Amino acid sequence: ATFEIVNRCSYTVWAAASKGDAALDAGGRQLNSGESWTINVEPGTNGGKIWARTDCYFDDSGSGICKTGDCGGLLRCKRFGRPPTTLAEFSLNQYGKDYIDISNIKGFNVPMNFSPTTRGCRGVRCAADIVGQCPAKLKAPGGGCNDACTVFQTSEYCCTTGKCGPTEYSRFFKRLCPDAFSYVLDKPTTVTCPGSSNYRVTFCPTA
Template sequence: MFIKFSLIVAAFTVAASARTFTVHNACPFTIWPAMFTGSGHPAPSYPTGWQAAAGTSVSFTVPDNWQAGRIWGRRGCDFSVNPGPNSCLDGGCNGGLVCDPTTGTGVPPATLAEFSLSAGGGDYYDVSLVDGYNLPLEITPSTSACHTASCPVDLGPNCPASLKGPFDSTGFPVGCKSDCLVDPNPSNSPSCCSGQYSTPATCPPSGVPHYNYFKSNCPNSYVYAYDESSGTALWSCLASYASDYTITFCP
Protein backbone atom coordinates (compact mmCIF):
# COMPACT_ATOMS: atom_id res chain seq x y z
CA MET A 1 0.00 0.00 0.00
CA PHE A 2 2.81 2.39 0.93
CA ILE A 3 4.71 1.59 -2.26
CA LYS A 4 1.63 2.14 -4.41
CA PHE A 5 0.87 5.47 -2.66
CA SER A 6 4.48 6.60 -3.15
CA LEU A 7 4.27 5.85 -6.84
CA ILE A 8 1.05 7.88 -7.14
CA VAL A 9 2.65 10.83 -5.33
CA ALA A 10 5.74 10.59 -7.52
CA ALA A 11 3.65 10.52 -10.68
CA PHE A 12 1.64 13.54 -9.53
CA THR A 13 4.84 15.44 -8.72
CA VAL A 14 6.25 14.77 -12.18
CA ALA A 15 3.00 15.83 -13.84
CA ALA A 16 2.74 18.98 -11.72
CA SER A 17 6.32 20.00 -12.46
CA ALA A 18 5.89 19.98 -16.24
CA ARG A 19 4.44 22.65 -18.53
CA THR A 20 2.49 22.11 -21.72
CA PHE A 21 3.80 23.81 -24.85
CA THR A 22 1.72 23.90 -28.02
CA VAL A 23 3.41 24.71 -31.32
CA HIS A 24 0.91 25.79 -33.98
CA ASN A 25 1.64 26.40 -37.66
CA ALA A 26 -0.85 29.03 -38.80
CA CYS A 27 1.17 29.64 -41.98
CA PRO A 28 -0.44 28.64 -45.31
CA PHE A 29 2.56 26.42 -46.06
CA THR A 30 4.57 23.63 -44.45
CA ILE A 31 7.32 24.56 -42.00
CA TRP A 32 9.73 22.46 -39.95
CA PRO A 33 9.78 23.58 -36.30
CA ALA A 34 12.93 22.93 -34.30
CA MET A 35 13.89 23.03 -30.64
CA PHE A 36 17.15 23.40 -28.70
CA THR A 37 18.11 23.35 -25.02
CA GLY A 38 21.21 25.00 -23.62
CA SER A 39 24.05 22.80 -22.39
CA GLY A 40 23.59 21.27 -18.94
CA HIS A 41 19.85 21.92 -18.68
CA PRO A 42 17.01 19.35 -18.66
CA ALA A 43 15.40 19.06 -22.08
CA PRO A 44 11.83 18.31 -23.20
CA SER A 45 11.18 14.66 -24.05
CA TYR A 46 10.04 15.52 -27.56
CA PRO A 47 11.90 15.40 -30.90
CA THR A 48 14.10 18.42 -31.56
CA GLY A 49 12.68 18.79 -35.07
CA TRP A 50 9.54 17.82 -36.96
CA GLN A 51 7.44 18.62 -40.02
CA ALA A 52 4.33 20.77 -39.53
CA ALA A 53 1.80 21.02 -42.33
CA ALA A 54 -0.24 24.22 -42.64
CA GLY A 55 -2.80 24.58 -39.88
CA THR A 56 -1.46 21.78 -37.66
CA SER A 57 -0.45 21.81 -33.99
CA VAL A 58 1.50 19.60 -31.62
CA SER A 59 1.55 19.71 -27.82
CA PHE A 60 4.20 18.33 -25.48
CA THR A 61 5.52 18.86 -21.97
CA VAL A 62 8.70 20.66 -21.02
CA PRO A 63 10.43 20.65 -17.63
CA ASP A 64 9.15 23.23 -15.17
CA ASN A 65 12.71 24.58 -15.02
CA TRP A 66 13.46 24.53 -18.75
CA GLN A 67 16.36 26.94 -19.19
CA ALA A 68 18.02 28.44 -22.27
CA GLY A 69 15.36 26.83 -24.45
CA ARG A 70 14.49 27.98 -27.93
CA ILE A 71 11.97 27.06 -30.62
CA TRP A 72 12.08 28.28 -34.21
CA GLY A 73 10.76 27.42 -37.65
CA ARG A 74 12.59 26.28 -40.77
CA ARG A 75 11.51 27.00 -44.34
CA GLY A 76 12.05 25.25 -47.65
CA CYS A 77 13.57 22.05 -46.28
CA ASP A 78 14.64 18.94 -48.19
CA PHE A 79 16.44 16.43 -45.99
CA SER A 80 16.73 13.72 -48.63
CA VAL A 81 19.78 15.18 -50.35
CA ASN A 82 21.61 17.15 -47.69
CA PRO A 83 20.53 16.25 -44.14
CA GLY A 84 22.65 18.95 -42.52
CA PRO A 85 22.31 22.64 -41.67
CA ASN A 86 22.00 23.65 -45.33
CA SER A 87 19.02 21.38 -46.04
CA CYS A 88 16.64 24.31 -45.42
CA LEU A 89 16.48 27.77 -46.97
CA ASP A 90 16.78 29.19 -43.47
CA GLY A 91 16.84 27.94 -39.89
CA GLY A 92 18.51 24.61 -40.75
CA CYS A 93 20.45 22.74 -38.09
CA ASN A 94 23.08 20.06 -37.63
CA GLY A 95 21.28 16.74 -37.74
CA GLY A 96 18.75 17.39 -40.48
CA LEU A 97 15.08 16.95 -39.58
CA VAL A 98 15.88 16.18 -35.94
CA CYS A 99 18.38 18.76 -34.73
CA ASP A 100 21.50 17.61 -32.92
CA PRO A 101 20.87 18.14 -29.17
CA THR A 102 24.32 19.65 -28.57
CA THR A 103 25.14 21.55 -31.79
CA GLY A 104 21.81 22.00 -33.56
CA THR A 105 21.13 25.62 -32.72
CA GLY A 106 19.89 26.70 -36.16
CA VAL A 107 21.33 28.72 -39.04
CA PRO A 108 20.34 32.41 -39.10
CA PRO A 109 18.35 34.28 -40.08
CA ALA A 110 15.69 32.77 -37.84
CA THR A 111 13.01 34.17 -35.56
CA LEU A 112 13.38 32.56 -32.13
CA ALA A 113 11.00 31.88 -29.27
CA GLU A 114 13.25 31.84 -26.20
CA PHE A 115 12.43 30.57 -22.70
CA SER A 116 13.89 30.31 -19.23
CA LEU A 117 11.23 28.92 -16.91
CA SER A 118 11.19 29.22 -13.11
CA ALA A 119 14.29 31.42 -13.16
CA GLY A 120 14.44 33.37 -9.90
CA GLY A 121 10.72 33.01 -9.32
CA GLY A 122 9.68 33.90 -12.84
CA ASP A 123 9.31 32.58 -16.36
CA TYR A 124 11.23 34.71 -18.83
CA TYR A 125 10.46 34.56 -22.54
CA ASP A 126 10.86 36.59 -25.71
CA VAL A 127 10.53 36.57 -29.47
CA SER A 128 14.06 37.28 -30.61
CA LEU A 129 15.20 38.90 -33.86
CA VAL A 130 18.82 39.08 -32.68
CA ASP A 131 19.63 36.30 -35.19
CA GLY A 132 17.46 37.92 -37.85
CA TYR A 133 13.96 37.05 -39.04
CA ASN A 134 12.44 34.23 -41.10
CA LEU A 135 8.82 33.78 -39.89
CA PRO A 136 6.22 35.78 -37.96
CA LEU A 137 6.01 34.36 -34.45
CA GLU A 138 4.00 34.79 -31.27
CA ILE A 139 4.27 33.42 -27.70
CA THR A 140 0.99 33.35 -25.80
CA PRO A 141 0.92 32.41 -22.10
CA SER A 142 -2.12 30.49 -20.86
CA THR A 143 -2.29 32.94 -17.95
CA SER A 144 -4.11 36.13 -18.97
CA ALA A 145 -2.10 38.15 -16.43
CA CYS A 146 1.04 37.61 -18.52
CA HIS A 147 2.03 39.44 -21.71
CA THR A 148 2.10 38.08 -25.25
CA ALA A 149 5.49 38.38 -26.99
CA SER A 150 5.33 38.68 -30.74
CA CYS A 151 6.66 39.62 -34.14
CA PRO A 152 3.45 39.23 -36.19
CA VAL A 153 4.73 41.05 -39.31
CA ASP A 154 6.36 39.53 -42.41
CA LEU A 155 9.64 41.46 -42.38
CA GLY A 156 10.98 39.89 -45.58
CA PRO A 157 9.41 41.94 -48.42
CA ASN A 158 10.31 45.37 -47.00
CA CYS A 159 13.60 44.30 -45.45
CA PRO A 160 16.46 46.75 -46.13
CA ALA A 161 18.33 45.70 -49.26
CA SER A 162 21.59 44.97 -47.44
CA LEU A 163 19.80 42.54 -45.11
CA LYS A 164 17.25 40.93 -47.42
CA GLY A 165 17.37 37.19 -48.02
CA PRO A 166 17.70 34.29 -48.46
CA PHE A 167 15.26 33.90 -51.36
CA ASP A 168 13.07 31.06 -52.53
CA SER A 169 12.94 29.74 -56.10
CA THR A 170 10.54 32.53 -57.13
CA GLY A 171 12.82 35.25 -55.80
CA PHE A 172 10.66 35.93 -52.71
CA PRO A 173 12.68 36.86 -49.61
CA VAL A 174 12.16 34.26 -46.89
CA GLY A 175 14.39 36.05 -44.43
CA CYS A 176 15.76 39.34 -43.18
CA LYS A 177 19.25 39.19 -41.72
CA SER A 178 20.36 41.06 -38.62
CA ASP A 179 22.89 43.90 -38.91
CA CYS A 180 25.35 41.77 -36.96
CA LEU A 181 25.06 38.93 -39.46
CA VAL A 182 26.25 41.11 -42.34
CA ASP A 183 28.82 43.11 -40.34
CA PRO A 184 32.33 42.78 -41.82
CA ASN A 185 33.92 42.95 -38.36
CA PRO A 186 31.55 41.10 -35.99
CA SER A 187 34.16 40.74 -33.23
CA ASN A 188 34.27 44.50 -32.65
CA SER A 189 30.97 45.94 -33.75
CA PRO A 190 28.12 48.12 -32.44
CA SER A 191 25.75 45.94 -34.49
CA CYS A 192 26.87 42.87 -32.54
CA CYS A 193 27.59 44.61 -29.20
CA SER A 194 31.05 43.05 -29.28
CA GLY A 195 34.61 44.16 -28.54
CA GLN A 196 34.68 47.76 -27.37
CA TYR A 197 30.88 47.86 -27.71
CA SER A 198 30.21 44.97 -25.33
CA THR A 199 28.28 46.83 -22.61
CA PRO A 200 24.82 48.42 -22.58
CA ALA A 201 26.43 51.86 -22.24
CA THR A 202 28.67 51.41 -25.29
CA CYS A 203 26.05 49.61 -27.38
CA PRO A 204 22.87 51.70 -27.49
CA PRO A 205 20.19 50.87 -30.08
CA SER A 206 21.18 53.97 -32.04
CA GLY A 207 24.39 52.16 -32.99
CA VAL A 208 22.51 49.35 -34.73
CA PRO A 209 21.84 50.64 -38.28
CA HIS A 210 18.41 49.07 -38.84
CA TYR A 211 17.19 48.79 -35.25
CA ASN A 212 14.17 50.98 -35.96
CA TYR A 213 13.02 48.82 -38.89
CA PHE A 214 12.77 45.74 -36.69
CA LYS A 215 11.52 47.47 -33.53
CA SER A 216 8.89 49.65 -35.19
CA ASN A 217 7.39 46.64 -36.99
CA CYS A 218 7.73 44.25 -34.05
CA PRO A 219 7.76 46.38 -30.88
CA ASN A 220 7.13 43.39 -28.58
CA SER A 221 10.21 41.52 -29.75
CA TYR A 222 13.87 41.38 -28.69
CA VAL A 223 15.76 43.14 -31.48
CA TYR A 224 19.41 43.37 -30.43
CA ALA A 225 21.71 42.21 -27.61
CA TYR A 226 20.74 44.88 -25.06
CA ASP A 227 17.16 45.52 -26.07
CA GLU A 228 15.85 44.98 -22.54
CA SER A 229 16.21 48.74 -22.04
CA SER A 230 13.25 49.22 -24.41
CA GLY A 231 10.92 47.68 -21.84
CA THR A 232 9.16 45.66 -24.55
CA ALA A 233 11.72 42.98 -25.34
CA LEU A 234 11.94 40.50 -22.47
CA TRP A 235 8.70 39.39 -20.81
CA SER A 236 8.11 37.66 -17.50
CA CYS A 237 5.36 35.63 -15.86
CA LEU A 238 5.31 34.56 -12.22
CA ALA A 239 6.52 30.98 -11.95
CA SER A 240 3.78 30.38 -9.38
CA TYR A 241 1.23 30.67 -12.21
CA ALA A 242 2.80 27.56 -13.79
CA SER A 243 1.72 28.95 -17.15
CA ASP A 244 1.59 26.86 -20.29
CA TYR A 245 2.64 28.48 -23.58
CA THR A 246 1.47 28.46 -27.19
CA ILE A 247 4.02 29.26 -29.90
CA THR A 248 2.28 30.28 -33.12
CA PHE A 249 3.98 30.72 -36.47
CA CYS A 250 2.28 33.25 -38.77
CA PRO A 251 -0.16 34.44 -36.07
Protein backbone atom coordinates (compact mmCIF):
# COMPACT_ATOMS: atom_id res chain seq x y z
CA ALA A 1 0.00 0.00 0.00
CA THR A 2 1.18 3.52 -0.67
CA PHE A 3 1.00 6.33 1.87
CA GLU A 4 1.81 9.78 0.58
CA ILE A 5 2.92 11.86 3.56
CA VAL A 6 2.57 15.59 2.94
CA ASN A 7 3.81 18.40 5.16
CA ARG A 8 1.55 21.44 4.69
CA CYS A 9 2.88 23.00 7.91
CA SER A 10 4.93 26.19 7.72
CA TYR A 11 7.62 24.39 9.76
CA THR A 12 9.75 21.34 9.03
CA VAL A 13 8.63 18.01 10.43
CA TRP A 14 10.33 14.64 10.51
CA ALA A 15 7.78 12.07 9.46
CA ALA A 16 7.90 8.65 11.15
CA ALA A 17 6.33 5.31 10.29
CA SER A 18 6.52 2.17 12.43
CA LYS A 19 4.53 -0.86 13.56
CA GLY A 20 6.17 -0.83 16.98
CA ASP A 21 8.73 -3.58 16.50
CA ALA A 22 9.92 -2.48 13.05
CA ALA A 23 10.16 0.44 10.66
CA LEU A 24 7.63 0.83 7.88
CA ASP A 25 9.57 1.63 4.68
CA ALA A 26 12.61 3.72 5.72
CA GLY A 27 10.91 4.52 9.05
CA GLY A 28 11.46 8.27 8.94
CA ARG A 29 12.44 11.25 6.82
CA GLN A 30 12.69 15.02 6.94
CA LEU A 31 9.84 16.92 5.28
CA ASN A 32 10.37 20.61 4.77
CA SER A 33 7.29 22.81 4.41
CA GLY A 34 5.41 21.65 1.32
CA GLU A 35 7.36 18.43 0.75
CA SER A 36 5.80 15.04 0.05
CA TRP A 37 7.27 11.63 0.85
CA THR A 38 5.63 8.46 -0.43
CA ILE A 39 6.19 5.23 1.45
CA ASN A 40 5.24 1.65 0.80
CA VAL A 41 3.65 -0.34 3.60
CA GLU A 42 3.40 -4.11 3.28
CA PRO A 43 -0.09 -5.56 2.89
CA GLY A 44 -1.32 -7.10 6.12
CA THR A 45 0.47 -4.58 8.33
CA ASN A 46 -1.26 -4.65 11.71
CA GLY A 47 -0.98 -1.79 14.17
CA GLY A 48 0.95 0.61 11.96
CA LYS A 49 1.34 4.27 12.91
CA ILE A 50 2.49 7.43 11.17
CA TRP A 51 3.30 10.63 13.05
CA ALA A 52 5.20 13.89 12.85
CA ARG A 53 8.22 14.80 14.93
CA THR A 54 9.16 18.40 15.63
CA ASP A 55 12.36 20.26 16.45
CA CYS A 56 14.77 17.49 15.54
CA TYR A 57 18.53 17.36 15.29
CA PHE A 58 20.35 14.45 13.64
CA ASP A 59 24.02 13.86 12.93
CA ASP A 60 25.35 12.09 9.77
CA SER A 61 24.65 8.64 11.18
CA GLY A 62 21.01 9.60 11.66
CA SER A 63 21.22 9.79 15.44
CA GLY A 64 19.91 12.66 17.50
CA ILE A 65 16.83 13.95 19.27
CA CYS A 66 13.38 15.45 18.60
CA LYS A 67 11.29 17.48 21.04
CA THR A 68 8.12 15.62 20.12
CA GLY A 69 7.75 12.07 18.85
CA ASP A 70 11.40 11.04 19.27
CA CYS A 71 11.86 7.33 18.51
CA GLY A 72 14.95 6.36 20.50
CA GLY A 73 16.97 9.12 18.87
CA LEU A 74 16.78 7.73 15.33
CA LEU A 75 16.01 9.55 12.10
CA ARG A 76 14.73 6.25 10.76
CA CYS A 77 12.25 5.04 13.37
CA LYS A 78 11.99 1.36 14.23
CA ARG A 79 9.87 1.98 17.33
CA PHE A 80 6.96 4.22 18.31
CA GLY A 81 7.56 7.82 19.29
CA ARG A 82 7.68 9.67 22.56
CA PRO A 83 4.45 11.51 23.41
CA PRO A 84 2.98 13.95 22.64
CA THR A 85 2.21 12.57 19.18
CA THR A 86 -0.91 12.92 17.06
CA LEU A 87 -1.26 9.41 15.56
CA ALA A 88 -2.44 8.14 12.19
CA GLU A 89 -3.23 4.48 12.94
CA PHE A 90 -3.97 1.65 10.56
CA SER A 91 -4.31 -2.08 10.13
CA LEU A 92 -4.38 -3.29 6.53
CA ASN A 93 -5.91 -6.39 4.90
CA GLN A 94 -7.66 -7.57 8.05
CA TYR A 95 -10.11 -10.16 6.75
CA GLY A 96 -10.57 -8.27 3.49
CA LYS A 97 -10.74 -4.69 4.80
CA ASP A 98 -8.49 -1.85 5.98
CA TYR A 99 -9.08 0.05 9.24
CA ILE A 100 -7.90 3.60 9.88
CA ASP A 101 -8.20 6.20 12.62
CA ILE A 102 -6.58 9.20 14.25
CA SER A 103 -5.75 9.01 17.95
CA ASN A 104 -4.99 11.58 20.66
CA ILE A 105 -4.47 8.83 23.26
CA LYS A 106 -0.72 9.61 23.20
CA GLY A 107 -1.33 13.37 23.05
CA PHE A 108 -1.20 15.85 20.20
CA ASN A 109 1.69 17.70 18.58
CA VAL A 110 0.80 18.46 14.94
CA PRO A 111 -2.63 18.68 13.25
CA MET A 112 -3.38 15.89 10.80
CA ASN A 113 -5.66 14.63 8.04
CA PHE A 114 -5.63 10.89 7.24
CA SER A 115 -7.58 10.09 4.07
CA PRO A 116 -7.85 7.37 1.45
CA THR A 117 -6.63 8.28 -2.05
CA THR A 118 -8.67 5.41 -3.51
CA ARG A 119 -12.42 4.76 -3.45
CA GLY A 120 -14.82 3.44 -0.88
CA CYS A 121 -14.46 5.29 2.43
CA ARG A 122 -14.00 8.68 4.06
CA GLY A 123 -11.00 10.27 5.74
CA VAL A 124 -10.60 11.46 9.31
CA ARG A 125 -9.07 14.67 10.60
CA CYS A 126 -7.89 16.35 13.79
CA ALA A 127 -6.83 19.86 12.84
CA ALA A 128 -8.05 22.03 15.72
CA ASP A 129 -5.53 24.12 17.68
CA ILE A 130 -5.09 21.59 20.47
CA VAL A 131 -1.62 22.86 21.43
CA GLY A 132 -2.85 26.46 21.73
CA GLN A 133 -5.92 25.49 23.74
CA CYS A 134 -4.20 22.75 25.78
CA PRO A 135 -5.11 22.58 29.51
CA ALA A 136 -2.26 24.02 31.59
CA LYS A 137 -1.57 20.74 33.36
CA LEU A 138 -1.23 18.87 30.05
CA LYS A 139 1.09 21.34 28.31
CA ALA A 140 4.39 19.72 27.42
CA PRO A 141 7.33 22.06 28.15
CA GLY A 142 9.14 20.41 25.25
CA GLY A 143 6.17 21.23 23.02
CA GLY A 144 2.71 19.79 22.34
CA CYS A 145 -0.24 18.75 24.49
CA ASN A 146 0.24 15.58 26.56
CA ASP A 147 -2.43 13.00 27.19
CA ALA A 148 -3.41 12.55 30.84
CA CYS A 149 -1.97 9.03 31.08
CA THR A 150 1.49 10.35 30.17
CA VAL A 151 1.20 13.13 32.73
CA PHE A 152 -0.45 11.42 35.71
CA GLN A 153 0.11 7.65 35.30
CA THR A 154 -3.19 6.51 36.82
CA SER A 155 -5.25 3.43 36.10
CA GLU A 156 -8.15 5.68 35.12
CA TYR A 157 -6.26 7.72 32.49
CA CYS A 158 -4.21 4.79 31.21
CA CYS A 159 -7.22 2.40 31.26
CA THR A 160 -4.90 -0.18 32.77
CA THR A 161 -7.65 -2.50 33.99
CA GLY A 162 -9.73 -2.15 30.84
CA LYS A 163 -12.25 -0.31 32.91
CA CYS A 164 -12.04 3.41 32.48
CA GLY A 165 -14.44 6.23 31.66
CA PRO A 166 -14.07 9.59 29.93
CA THR A 167 -12.35 12.26 32.00
CA GLU A 168 -12.11 16.06 32.07
CA TYR A 169 -8.86 15.69 30.12
CA SER A 170 -10.14 13.22 27.51
CA ARG A 171 -13.20 15.41 26.96
CA PHE A 172 -10.92 18.32 26.03
CA PHE A 173 -9.35 16.30 23.21
CA LYS A 174 -12.79 15.03 22.18
CA ARG A 175 -14.31 18.51 22.14
CA LEU A 176 -11.57 19.86 19.88
CA CYS A 177 -11.38 16.69 17.75
CA PRO A 178 -14.57 14.62 17.79
CA ASP A 179 -13.28 12.30 15.07
CA ALA A 180 -10.18 11.11 16.96
CA PHE A 181 -9.80 8.69 19.88
CA SER A 182 -9.56 10.68 23.13
CA TYR A 183 -9.05 7.77 25.55
CA VAL A 184 -8.64 4.01 25.27
CA LEU A 185 -12.33 3.08 25.57
CA ASP A 186 -13.66 6.01 23.54
CA LYS A 187 -16.56 5.28 21.21
CA PRO A 188 -14.60 4.18 18.14
CA THR A 189 -14.00 6.58 15.26
CA THR A 190 -12.35 3.90 13.15
CA VAL A 191 -13.17 3.96 9.44
CA THR A 192 -13.51 0.76 7.42
CA CYS A 193 -11.93 1.03 3.98
CA PRO A 194 -11.66 -1.46 1.13
CA GLY A 195 -8.78 -3.89 1.58
CA SER A 196 -5.57 -2.63 -0.06
CA SER A 197 -6.63 1.02 -0.16
CA ASN A 198 -3.97 3.72 -0.54
CA TYR A 199 -3.73 6.82 1.64
CA ARG A 200 -2.47 10.32 2.22
CA VAL A 201 -1.43 11.71 5.60
CA THR A 202 -1.34 15.51 5.56
CA PHE A 203 0.23 17.49 8.39
CA CYS A 204 -1.41 20.90 8.97
CA PRO A 205 -4.18 20.23 6.42
CA THR A 206 -5.86 23.61 7.01
CA ALA A 207 -2.61 25.58 6.73
